[PDB]
Design a protein around this ligand. Sequence first.
Ligand SMILES: [Mg+2]
Ligand SMILES: [Mg+2]
Ligand SMILES: [Mg+2]
Ligand SMILES: [Mg+2]
Ligand SMILES: [Mg+2]
Ligand SMILES: [Mg+2]
Ligand SMILES: [Mg+2]
Ligand SMILES: [Mg+2]
Ligand SMILES: [Zn+2]
Ligand SMILES: [Zn+2]
Lengths: 98, 160, 102, 70, 83, 150, 24, 91
Amino acid sequence: KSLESINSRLQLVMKSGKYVLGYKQTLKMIRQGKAKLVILANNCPALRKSEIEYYAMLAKTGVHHYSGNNIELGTACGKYYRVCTLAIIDPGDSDIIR
Amino acid sequence: QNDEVAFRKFKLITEDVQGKNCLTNFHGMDLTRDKMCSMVKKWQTMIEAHVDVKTTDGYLLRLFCVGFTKKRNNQIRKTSYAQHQQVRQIRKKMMEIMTREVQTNDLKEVVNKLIPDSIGKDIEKACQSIYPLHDVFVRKVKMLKKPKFELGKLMELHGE
Amino acid sequence: TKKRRNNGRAKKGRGHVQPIRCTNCARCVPKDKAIKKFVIRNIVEAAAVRDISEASVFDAYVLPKLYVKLHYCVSCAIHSKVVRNRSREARKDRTPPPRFRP
Amino acid sequence: AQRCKELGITALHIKLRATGGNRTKTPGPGAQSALRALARSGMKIGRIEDVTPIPSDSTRRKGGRRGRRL
Amino acid sequence: PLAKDLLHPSPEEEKRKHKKKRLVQSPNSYFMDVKCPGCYKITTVFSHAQTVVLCVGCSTVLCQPTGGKARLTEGCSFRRKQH
Amino acid sequence: GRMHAPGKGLSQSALPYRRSVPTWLKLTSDDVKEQIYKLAKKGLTPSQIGVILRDSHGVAQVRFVTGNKILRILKSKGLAPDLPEDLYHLIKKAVAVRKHLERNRKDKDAKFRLILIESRIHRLARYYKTKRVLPPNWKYESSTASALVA
Amino acid sequence: MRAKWRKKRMRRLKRKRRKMRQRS
Amino acid sequence: AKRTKKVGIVGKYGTRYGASLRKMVKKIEISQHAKYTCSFCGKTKMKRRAVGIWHCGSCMKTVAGGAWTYNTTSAVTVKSAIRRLKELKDQ
RNA sequence: GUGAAAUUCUUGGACCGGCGCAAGACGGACCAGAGCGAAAGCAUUUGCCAAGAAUGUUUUCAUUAAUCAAGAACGAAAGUCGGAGGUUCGAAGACGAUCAGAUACCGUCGUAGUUCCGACCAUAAACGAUGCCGACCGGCGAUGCGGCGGCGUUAUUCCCAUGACCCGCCGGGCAGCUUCCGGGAAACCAAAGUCUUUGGGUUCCGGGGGGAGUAUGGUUGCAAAGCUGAAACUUAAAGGAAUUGACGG
Ligand SMILES: [Mg+2]
Ligand SMILES: [Mg+2]
Ligand SMILES: [Mg+2]
Ligand SMILES: [Mg+2]
Ligand SMILES: [Mg+2]
Ligand SMILES: [Mg+2]
Ligand SMILES: [Mg+2]
Ligand SMILES: [Mg+2]
Ligand SMILES: [Zn+2]
Ligand SMILES: [Zn+2]
């Protein structure tokens, strides 16, 4: 039930909130301090995963390890490309509790 | 036992012999054929559970439990069939209350408490709120492993 | 002509019923079609109950029963006279013959 | 019975056995007479139990699906 | 019965019949006012509610969904709406 | 009778003969409209909006109290879903069955259910294109549908 | 004959006919 | 248009070697020359280099696999069994 | 082992009893005119994954529906191909019996097969020998699921909930008993009724028996075979249900 819940909430982050897709943009948003949640596919390289975790710890923002992969994370985002890392600027749908 | 039931048997394998006496230890128990075949009846559901559980002293036991749904004294319906969820809950309950009578005690006080089948009696008591059961017993236990055969344990089981 | 409404078996809302082997001739018979007799016989004959009681080391010893469930194909059932052919109206009833207790 | 008596055995437990397995479960004609002869020959009788091999389920019984045609 | 009055059935068999098979459709469900202990406000709850109804002023559940009827939590009072 | 089952069930909802708003209902039409707007912002489909409104707020029929159906209200405000609710759920079910099927090739029962669900999807899509809710060139493809649902 | 054995005889004859025709 | 009714990839062998042998080698060659989705980078570039060696062009990951398929059913069942025996061994 | 035997195993310890080991099947009794599934079919425990009927609904859409040439998915058992495995049973085959003969029925052995994965085949008395959707037309007692309402008993607990019984009602099912509803050649069927008082919608399909599901052509299949499918000629009956009699190892 958790996976369908996070998929539905991710779908509702699209079309209603400000997000950003990809690694470079995620790091840019994190170091600007406006990334409130970072989602990582388990297909992510371990070095990239650890570095994004350290960046989030510095920015004091949450990291969710998606139980899919970059293909499945891309499908969950509603896109037709692989996304391996993404950030939510503001959910608009209570995925990120106020 | 002096005055206990007669449908229960024990295996009692022999480990050490000294003098003209063969000294035994528990190997397993089983019900008799006639009692088991008399208990199984139509128009009722029987629940069978087994669990591999290790004693404190290293004896591994496979306890088999059986239980039969009991019709009420005022029941008009021919059959007393429990639903699949009820049978599953009964099986889970009587697995987890065969585990705890073995995990926390030695083989000796396991054997002496399955002598009156107290485990089956409290299983019968525990399942009344799901579906009544009447013929509840530990049908079988078999010895799966034995711990190295310390002679002192055998002698204190026989002697004091 | 259709001899029986249930076609001589209890299969009503099923497609297939698992087969069993006749206890007499080991014929593969469907489980719902074979004739079943649950015989509950004293393990010793009525002629020998007194002698076993005399030779028993116990005083209040109950003689054990012998529980056997028998399955017959209708061929062996008819040949062994457990079931008999009946009239057209007498085929319809399903009441088992009475135990004849007295 | 006479061999058991001359070897100093007085009482007997009884274990009746049929063919078992996937084959017949009914004991043969000799069970009743054997047990009665044991009883009336002076031998004492203890526990009696059926020990027929009952499969929880067996291999295929011999004869084919049409059985033994006679 | 050849002369059963189909125009004016008595209310007993009108009630026992299925909701659709009545002379005129009448739902079996209704609405109720539920009083939560320790609270002042009143919440109107569907009798056959499919969702867990909560007080907005207290983090307490009022009814639990079941197969046919929502089951009210104990200590809660209820009445009917216009019969 | 069911479309793809040999079931002939009767479980329905018996709408009462009184179309009038109950006197104990204090909520006005605009209040119910704003509630529907909020619940649509939360992401609830019109069926769920109706269920929540009836269960908690005591409104019997949104149409009876506002004069408009829930989907009409959402479409007028401009936040109705891009796909119709039932077609969306059917595509979701087909995607779930396909995801289960690519790991379990021997589940021919699941294959049969997938065929039934996709037949329902095609019939409903043909209906929606007839009503011009959907674009005339809209088409359900198995590969690309997974990005649309859940 | 039993109808099943007539069917079997017909199948044997049909295979023989196919073999004869393929031989040409 | 469709160029071959049934031979497909083994049309290169002509009439030689027998129909059943060509059919038997057809699926093996299809799996051999297919490109599998890489489980590390997600791109469909994992292709066979030599027998048993599978290399992804994107992330330059080389994986030891089956002779003709990326993973054999034997190895998959073995991996599952080893996982189960590991989780049984520890507690 | 058998009706009786014999082939067969046996002082090399056969059969029997005990203790273990291994392998592959099979899930008894519970198991029912009970359940689920489109059928074929599905019965050890637990976990995971999707799916589904029925019920409840004052939820949503608003006609989206029924049946369906062509086409497609599945399709017992046997059979085929490839890889494992092969305990039991057991086509073929060998032998022992029986017999006038016995290429069989009975017995011993035993290959393919029977078990799992992958790919074919698409046939069964695949049956309810009985198309699907819808409406109406008797009664009665049960049973499976869901729901609703009730004297009471019972389980803990201090009471209600919730289980297990008891009494009913509703909805969908598997069925049963009964009936001069009615139909039918009848057997029988609450459907096989609402049919000369002939029309609810729709699909497939039969036209005396044989020849014959044969020949030929086409098409599918590795093959076995599957689908489509005549004609010449022959024949006065072939058949169905019931009745009386005769006969029955
Ligand atoms: Mg006849
Ligand atoms: Mg069948
Ligand atoms: Mg005979
Ligand atoms: Mg098959
Ligand atoms: Mg093979
Ligand atoms: Mg043999
Ligand atoms: Mg029609
Ligand atoms: Mg004709
Ligand atoms: Zn028989
Ligand atoms: Zn890669």
